[PDB]
Write a protein that binds this ligand. Structure first.
Ligand code: CDL
Ligand code: ZMP
Ligand code: SF4
Ligand code: SF4
Ligand code: SF4
Ligand code: SF4
Ligand code: FES
Ligand code: K
Ligand code: ZN
Lengths: 263, 95, 381, 176, 114, 113, 126, 48, 96, 208
């Protein structure tokens, strides 16, 4: 073979050339945190949550877009890696709104969960927050852009998998806004899957909105019958009533997407 | 702002009222259906839209720590008021 | 042949007696009449949610069992409470000890026949339940001592009232002790009754006064000390004959020494916070929950999911007034316990009831069920 | 650090032996117990005149549940379901939907008061002070299903008891 | 596949224990109907004991029938010693329960349960 | 000195504790001689019993022997010597110096699962 | 000796006290649970789980609650391997079906692929 | 009020004879106290 | 506190104790039911600098249990701790 | 890590490690593992044939003197072929110490009763029969202690539901408390509360 040896916390692993730091850590079961990286989108590298120390190197590197070189020891649990995670989570929660009780993403939020796992437990932010004008992209996705953390999974999904090219960032700096820039109604055949990949409650499901809450739902694994693809789904229910339909990972059918009729 | 079904049974703030042919009205026979007569959707429509001179307003529901979590509302739309998501109060930039 | 009686459930206890006239040849306590499956319900609830079950085990020793469970969870979390929370825990643990020994002594006198110091000492017990209601809002089951410290700081003017109570409570102990200790009828009901040797008391798993009435010099607040019991000064009463009268005197002297500890805790209460300042375990303040983003996320995740406890097993035992109260807590890494065995002293004491009532009479069985302070909530779980 | 209860040896001179025999024959400690009971006969009893006199309570007291409103009539509850998530008895059942003005509100908010353990985790989990466990403890019923409160009963409890609930929260919120 | 035994070494010692337990229950049933003043006949209680023994007749494991004999001994101890009440004895006779649907068609009529 | 009581209920005062401890310690060593030499129980129990017996043979006083045997009252030191003697008599029958009777299953003590 | 030989299949169904209605009619699903697609973490996809088929939930006439008659409706069991769950289901007389663990296949990620000279995989924005 | 009494007796209420259409001359009831007096009567505050 | 001195003297004679010094009924010496509002202190982690959570983390400094012996010379015999120090008798009131 | 982190006691850790070596080398016939937790608690994991030789050693050996049986516990872990994990918590008053002795069984292997060593177990492992179904051989009075008399099954097994299979009610036809199949007016609502992000990297298990 041509596998190069790298190290994750001293443990040797044999990876292909071109494998990043994040996948090399995934091969030993360690999951580096992330917000903008998604394994089916293109690599963006623009949330800096995956910053990890390579030892004998005086700079943390973005693990989603850094290919490993032969001989690196990836320190996934060292001190400056955890300081990088706490700092980036502090900046992510600097302008994020206190909407967790009124947010549908609460209980299933990536920002909540890895703020618990990797963030600081309190705030140093003594200022006022930004408030972003909400957009209207159709009757399926509820858009509350104050909750956006600008990870650009919107744009990569609509540009690459949905093939639409109608989401993007207008503005510059802290005033940068993911949106459509006009009252344009983002209605693809795969327009609901951005509810899946949005790590925050900026894009939620408008028919599902306010009705249920993910800890109380029972998850039953089932099959789509709306089309002849055979998409694996999870029907999540609550007290004998169907609440929503989510995809399942099947690498040969629907990789982790479903059509809008299914959803 | 309560209303009443043709059965005489009062309609709640949800809109719930039993049907005419539903047996479960027998629990109110000889007793009363307890509804609240202060509908919050009617009481929040009586509040004035607060005219402010900023682009972003904040709301904490009044009282400080006695209200809700403090949220910031963007007021860039002159077409529409910016409603607080917790308390239902609504704001407008005055220009 | 010999007599067989069934003193049934008409807490509660079923007793199957094999008697030989006036004597007692065999005492079989049928229990389970308050088995509610507490430590299976704990397995489906989070650590904060499993906390109020411990109030209802020894339902005259509420904040003690809260303290034992909180110490178990804080041991598995590798965090410690602030010092003021520790002094508040020891303060209300000794107030709880006064509650339990008033319940013990006055019901042990009520069952034998002295029905009057019951009414005399439940007014003092009513005032201590007012202390619980002022500190937490409920009179018995407070849910106050939590992993990380306590739930809420002492309201202003509570310590002055605990002073005014503790100043007068020794006279109440003295008039109880005037009614019972030198009373010849009380001594005739308790002196030759249930003599427990020290080796059989160690073997039967006895704990607390059930050891210390037999001369064993063992108290977990001295030997395996918890929160600030190495910083208070008190004495440990030791019996001489292992009978009901020495255990009565040990409980009266533990009321004396609890008053001593409460005086020292009132004079040595430090300033500071009352929860651990890790907001990933103890919830933030409501003023900063409604202002900070991290604190709102931590409020949400602690009151829906709860803190994840690292995987591990612990046996945390404290000195409850009935004896060694233990929690064997097994955590699998989630925010709910995998297992929570609840060791309570009354279970082993009621197991030793059969040896303690050999050769005695039928009206000595109620004295032996009194000298083991048996609350069947902690026995049956 | 330890003391011996009941390890006194009685004296054996003629004085103390005659003292113990006088205590036996003349019933002196029994007269001491009669004297203590006679002392309590001539005290004022601790008895309050209920229902006309009430036992003293604190502003932290956990009684009957109520749903509060903002000072505009809008109800505080925004259906976040933290209170049924933390409820150790699972006494709270909540169902929600957006209403006609888009507000996140509940359609079902039930508290089974016979399941409730009255520990007040719902009021301390509530991020907007909506559910409170107010001051009322005199709400005994003649029927079991009268202790199964829906949202209308809890909102009527809030409208009934707000004048006292707001003052208790005002007196207590700085400890919270 | 070598296990530590409970009481029996093979199936024949276990059938000896089952046989003596059935003998003890068969002797006990008239006293059980008498002192609990049950409304059943002695034959009906003996048919219930026969039904409860034949319910577990398919077991071919010595340790499982060892634990079944031990649990039958515990039930017999709770019956001879008056520890059970009349309710605990009559819980074997599921009287107040409705007759369960047996065929396909009535189970189709009443609900979804297979 | 004639200690009037031990303090512990059910444990009477032994009048001659020195000769009693010497008899019990030499009987422990005599029973303990029947164990093979490579067993760690024999070496450790000979070590602690020889330390205790040299302390008993060094001191004529009862009470200073209590403060340097470091085991409480002298009567519960006697009772622990009796318990050690009965333990050694059991350990001859059990033979626990042997290797492990059975390896556990692979994930038998893996926690968490 | 003191060890007997039992070459039979392990079976404890007459000891567990389960009524027969919930033994020979219930179908245990043994599966690795799917990752919640709202989230990106995979700590819930590590262990094998055994659940059962859902039975009837209905509406309470009084309050509108979800009444049930299924005792096993909330029973979720956790297993380290698939074989432990299969052995536990065979031991308890439960008929079972086993879904295989679905793992995400290794992806070939290149950040430079966003900026190719001649390939279609250029991003139009970033 | 009577601040010479002990704590518990020092505040009390004489219920009315007719409240909401019920003759409460003999049927006095604990729930007849309105909530603005319920902090004062249960000593939740010092202030009437 | 309302008893006349004849009944008060009969009561103190019958009990044998001075009961007015320690009355079990509470009076004006208690705290006020209305209090001034508090200002509770912040803890030690309320800081704006040198306050990284990776230097004050408790749940992640806990380790798995160290395996001392597993099945995959003249050393001293040991005990789980030194023997317990003998309790000293009280000087306050030993009843001796 | 001064205010909020529980302080490590390295003295008791080194002492319990030395005593764990001591017990592992005196009794190699049964001792399978010896481990000391990060909060300094010693566990001796033994084979179920050596319940009586280990517990009589720690009760009687002059360096151990574990005279008190604090607690006796079973833990149900269904992913093991020996699903039940029997836990003995022992207290030495001479050396002020606590030790945990852990063994294992499945449903059908009996464990030898330790009532010969500690009579306290006379109810405790009796409880283990009522709750778990672990038979204890040579027990004087082994029967149910906590559940109702006609109760079938063992409740603390994890394949046993939260509610039972039967519920009681008074029936007026038969004038009797009767048992019927359990039907709840409201189902116990199972919450899925586990976060999908790893909390503790120290406890990370290596993959396949
Ligand atoms: C002995 C026979 C009775 C003699 C009178 C008597 O002892 O009166 C109690 C009177 C009050 O005793 P206290 O314990 O000091 O009461 C203090 C209270 O604060 C004083 O009580 P208060 O301050 O609360 O004042 C209110 C109280 C005032 O108290 C009285 O009016 C006393 C009762 C008088 C009759 O009035 C009432 O409560 C009305 C009671 C009406 C019925 C009384 C019983 C009638 C019995 C015959 C039928 O006792 C004495 O003054 C000492 C003994 C006098 C012996 C008199 C010669 C015999
Ligand atoms: C009044 C009502 C009270 C009800 C009494 C309930 C007690 C029932 C206890 C149940 C005890 C058992 O089921 S143990 C029997 C299980 N035996 C086996 O699995 C082995 C097969 N045994 C048999 O076939 C038995 O009929 C015999 C008699 C041992 C052998 O017959 P085969 O030969 O032809
Ligand atoms: S997106 Fe996440 S962090 Fe933001 S308000 Fe919603 S649940 Fe809270
Ligand atoms: S709306 Fe969501 S998916 Fe889109 S850029 Fe913002 S955080 Fe990312
Ligand atoms: S007080 Fe406790 S039990 Fe009652 S509804 Fe609130 S959280 Fe639930
Ligand atoms: S009462 Fe409070 S905690 Fe409960 S759902 Fe409403 S807002 Fe949330
Ligand atoms: S995950 Fe690598 S930077 Fe966003
Ligand atoms: K989303
Ligand atoms: Zn607002």
């Amino acid at each position: 073979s041509n596998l190069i040896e790298v190290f994750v916390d001293g443990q040797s692993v044999m990876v292909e050339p071109g494998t990043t730091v994040l996948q090399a850590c995934e091969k030993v079961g360690m999951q580096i945190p992330r917000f903008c990286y998604h394994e089916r989108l293109s690599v963006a590298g623009n949330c800096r949550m995956c910053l990890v120390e390579i030892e004998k190197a005086p700079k943390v590197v973005a693990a989603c877009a850094m290919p490993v070189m032969k001989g690196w020891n990836i320190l996934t649990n060292s001190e400056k890696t955890k300081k990088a995670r706490e700092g980036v989570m502090e900046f992510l929660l600097a302008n994020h709104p206190l909407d967790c009780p009124i947010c549908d993403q609460g209980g299933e939020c990536d920002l909540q969960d890895q703020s618990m796992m990797f963030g600081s437990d309190r705030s140093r932010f003594l200022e006022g927050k930004r408030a972003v004008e909400d957009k209207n992209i159709g009757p399926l996705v509820k858009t509350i852009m104050t909750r956006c953390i600008q990870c650009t999974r919107c744009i990569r999904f609509a540009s690459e998998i949905a093939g639409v090219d109608d989401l993007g960032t207008t503005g510059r700096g802290n005033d940068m806004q993911v949106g459509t820039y006009i009252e344009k109604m983002f209605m693809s055949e795969l327009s609901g899957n951005i509810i899946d990949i949005c790590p925050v409650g900026a894009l939620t499901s408008k028919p599902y909105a306010f009705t249920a809450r993910p800890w109380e739902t029972r998850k039953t694994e089932s099959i789509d019958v709306m089309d002849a693809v055979g998409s694996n789904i999870v029907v999540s229910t609550r007290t004998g009533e169907v609440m929503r339909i989510l995809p399942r990972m099947h690498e040969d059918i629907n990789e982790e997407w479903i059509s809008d009729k299914t959803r | 702002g309560v209303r009443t079904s043709p059965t005489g049974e009062k309609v709640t703030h949800t809109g719930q009222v039993y049907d005419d042919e539903d047996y479960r009205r027998v629990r109110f026979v000889g007793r009363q259906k307890e509804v609240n007569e202060n509908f919050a959707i009617d009481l929040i429509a009586e509040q004035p839209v607060s005219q402010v001179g900023s682009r972003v307003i904040s709301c904490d529901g009044g009282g400080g720590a006695l209200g809700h979590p403090r949220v910031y509302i963007n007021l860039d739309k002159e077409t529409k008021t910016g409603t607080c998501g917790y308390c239902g109060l609504q704001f407008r930039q005055q220009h | 042949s010999n007599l067989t009686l069934n003193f049934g459930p008409q807490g509660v206890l079923r007793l199957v007696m094999e008697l030989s006239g006036e004597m007692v040849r065999k005492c079989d306590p049928h229990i389970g009449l308050l088995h509610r499956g507490t430590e299976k319900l704990i397995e489906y609830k989070t650590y904060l949610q499993a906390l109020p079950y411990f109030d209802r085990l020894d339902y005259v020793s509420m904040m003690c069992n809260e303290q034992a469970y909180s110490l178990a969870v804080e041991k598995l979390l590798n965090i410690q409470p602030p010092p003021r929370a520790q002094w508040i825990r020891v303060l209300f643990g000794e107030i709880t000890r006064l509650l339990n020994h008033i319940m013990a002594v006055t019901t042990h006198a009520l069952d034998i026949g002295a029905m009057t110091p019951f009414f005399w000492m439940f007014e003092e017990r009513e005032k201590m339940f007012e202390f619980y209601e002022r500190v937490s809002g409920a009179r018995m089951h407070a849910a106050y001592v939590r992993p990380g410290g306590v739930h809420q700081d002492l309201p202003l003017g509570l310590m002055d009232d605990i002073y005014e109570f503790s100043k007068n409570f020794s006279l109440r102990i003295d008039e109880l002790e005037e009614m019972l200790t030198n009373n010849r009828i009380w001594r005739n009901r308790t002196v030759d009754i249930g003599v427990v040797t020290a080796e059989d008391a160690l073997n039967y798993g006895f704990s607390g006064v059930m050891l210390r009435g037999s001369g064993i010099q063992w108290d977990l607040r001295k030997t395996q000390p918890y929160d600030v019991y190495d910083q208070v000064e008190f004495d440990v009463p030791i019996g001489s004959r292992g009978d009901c009268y020495d255990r009565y005197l040990c409980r009266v002297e533990e009321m004396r020494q609890s008053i001593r500890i409460i005086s020292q805790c009132l004079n040595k209460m430090p300033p500071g916070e009352i929860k651990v300042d890790d907001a990933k375990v103890s919830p933030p303040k409501r003023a900063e929950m409604k202002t900070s983003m991290e604190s709102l996320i931590h409020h949400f995740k602690l009151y829906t999911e709860g803190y994840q406890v690292p995987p591990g097993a612990t046996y945390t035992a404290i000195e409850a007034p009935k004896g060694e109260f233990g929690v064997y807590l097994v955590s699998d890494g989630s925010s709910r316990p995998y297992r929570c065995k609840i060791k309570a002293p009354g279970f082993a004491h009621l197991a030793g009831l059969d040896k303690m009532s050999k050769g005695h009479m039928l009206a000595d069985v109620v004295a032996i069920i009194g000298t083991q302070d048996i609350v069947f909530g902690e026995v049956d779980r | 650090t330890y003391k011996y209860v009941n390890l006194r040896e009685p004296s054996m001179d003629m004085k103390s032996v005659t003292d113990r025999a006088a205590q036996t024959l003349l019933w002196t400690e029994l007269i001491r117990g009669l004297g203590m009971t006679l002392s309590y006969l001539f005290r004022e009893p601790a008895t309050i005149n209920y229902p006309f006199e009430k036992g003293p309570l604190s502003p932290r007291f956990r009684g009957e549940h109520a749903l509060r409103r903002y000072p505009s009539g809008e109800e505080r509850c925004i259906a976040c379901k933290l209170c049924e998530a933390v409820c150790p008895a699972q006494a709270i059942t909540i169902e929600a939907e957006p209403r006609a003005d888009g507000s996140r509100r509940t359609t079902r908010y039930d508290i089974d008061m016979t399941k409730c353990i009255y520990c007040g985790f719902c009021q301390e989990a509530c991020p907007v002070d909506a559910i409170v466990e107010g001051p009322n403890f005199e709400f005994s019923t003649e029927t079991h299903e009268e202790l199964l409160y829906n949202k209308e009963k809890l909102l009527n409890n809030g409208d009934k008891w707000e004048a006292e609930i707001a003052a208790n929260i005002q007196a207590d919120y700085l400890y919270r | 596949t070598s296990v530590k035994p409970i009481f029996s070494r093979d199936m024949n010692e276990a059938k000896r224990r089952v046989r003596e337990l059935y003998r003890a229950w068969y002797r006990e049933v008239p006293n059980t109907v008498h002192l609990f003043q049950l409304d059943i006949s002695v034959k009906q209680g003996r048919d219930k004991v026969r039904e409860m023994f034949k319910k577990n007749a398919h077991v071919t494991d010595p340790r499982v029938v060892d634990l079944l004999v031990i649990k039958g001994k515990m039930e017999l101890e709770e019956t001879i010693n008056v520890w059970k009440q009349r309710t605990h004895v009559m819980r074997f006779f599921h009287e107040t329960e409705a007759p369960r649907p047996k065929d396909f068609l009535s189970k189709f009529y009443v609900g979804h349960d297979p | 000195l004639l200690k009037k009581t031990t303090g512990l209920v059910g444990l009477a005062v032994c009048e001659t504790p020195h000769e009693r401890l010497k008899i019990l310690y030499t009987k422990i060593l005599d029973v303990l001689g029947h164990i093979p030499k490579n067993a760690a129980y024999r070496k450790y129990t000979e070590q602690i019993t020889n330390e205790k017996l040299s302390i008993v043979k060094a001191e004529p006083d009862v009470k200073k022997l209590e403060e340097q045997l470091q085991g409480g009252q002298i009567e519960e030191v006697i009772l622990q010597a009796e318990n050690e003697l009965s333990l050694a008599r059991k350990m001859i029958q059990w033979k626990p110096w042997e290797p492990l009777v059975e390896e556990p299953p692979a994930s038998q003590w893996k926690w968490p699962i | 000796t003191q060890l007997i030989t039992v070459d039979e299949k392990l079976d404890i169904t007459t000891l567990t006290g389960v009524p027969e209605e919930h033994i020979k009619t219930r179908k245990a699903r043994i599966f690795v649970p799917a990752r919640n697609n709202m989230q990106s973490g995979v700590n819930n996809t590590k262990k094998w789980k055994m659940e059962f088929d859902t039975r009837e939930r209905w509406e309470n006439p009084l309050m509108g609650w979800a009444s049930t008659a299924d005792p096993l409706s909330n029973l979720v069991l956790t297993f380290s391997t698939k074989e432990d769950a299969i052995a536990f289901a065979e031991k308890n007389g439960w008929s079972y079906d086993v879904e295989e663990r679905k793992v995400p296949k290794p992806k070939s990620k290149s950040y430079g692929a966003n900026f190719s000279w001649n390939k279609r995989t250029r991003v139009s924005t970033k | 009020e009577d601040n010479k009494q002990f704590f518990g007796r020092h505040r009390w209420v004489i219920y009315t004879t007719e409240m909401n259409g019920k003759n409460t001359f003999w049927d006095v009831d604990g729930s007849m106290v309105p909530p603005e007096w319920h902090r004062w009567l249960h000593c939740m505050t010092d202030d009437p | 506190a309302s008893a006349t001195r004849l009944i008060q003297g009969l009561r103190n004679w019958a009990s044998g104790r001075d009961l007015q010094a320690k009355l079990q009924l509470r009076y004006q010496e208690i705290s006020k039911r209305t209090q001034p509002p508090p200002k509770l202190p912040v803890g030690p982690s309320h800081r704006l600098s040198n306050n990284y959570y990776c230097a004050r983390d408790g749940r992640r400094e806990a380790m798995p249990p160290s395996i001392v012996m597993s099945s995959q010379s003249e050393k001293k015999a040991v005990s789980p701790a030194p023997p317990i120090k003998r309790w000293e008798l009280s000087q306050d009131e030993p009843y001796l | 890590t001064r205010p909020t982190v529980r302080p490590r006691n390295d003295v008791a850790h080194k002492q319990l490690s030395a005593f764990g070596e001591y017990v592992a080398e005196i009794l190699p016939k049964y001792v399978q593992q010896v481990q000391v937790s990060c909060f300094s608690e010693l566990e001796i994991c033994i084979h179920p044939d050596g319940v009586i030789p280990v517990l009589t050693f720690l009760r009687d050996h002059s360096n151990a003197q574990f005279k008190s049986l604090a607690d006796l516990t079973a833990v149900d872990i269904p992913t093991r072929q020996n699903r039940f994990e029997i836990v003995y918590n022992l207290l030495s008053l001479r050396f002020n110490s606590r030790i945990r002795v852990k063994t294992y069984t499945d449903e059908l292997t009996p464990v030898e009763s330790s009532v010969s060593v500690y009579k306290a177990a006379n109810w405790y492992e009796r409880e283990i029969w009522d709750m778990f179904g672990v038979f204890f051989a040579n027990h004087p009075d082994l029967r149910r202690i906590l559940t109702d008399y006609g109760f079938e099954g063992h409740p603390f097994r994890k394949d046993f539901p939260l509610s039972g299979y039967v519920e009681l009610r008074y029936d007026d036809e038969v004038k009797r408390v009767v048992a019927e199949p359990v039907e709840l007016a409201q189902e116990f609502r199972k919450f899925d509360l586990n976060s999908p992000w790893e909390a503790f990297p120290a406890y990370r298990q290596p993959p396949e």
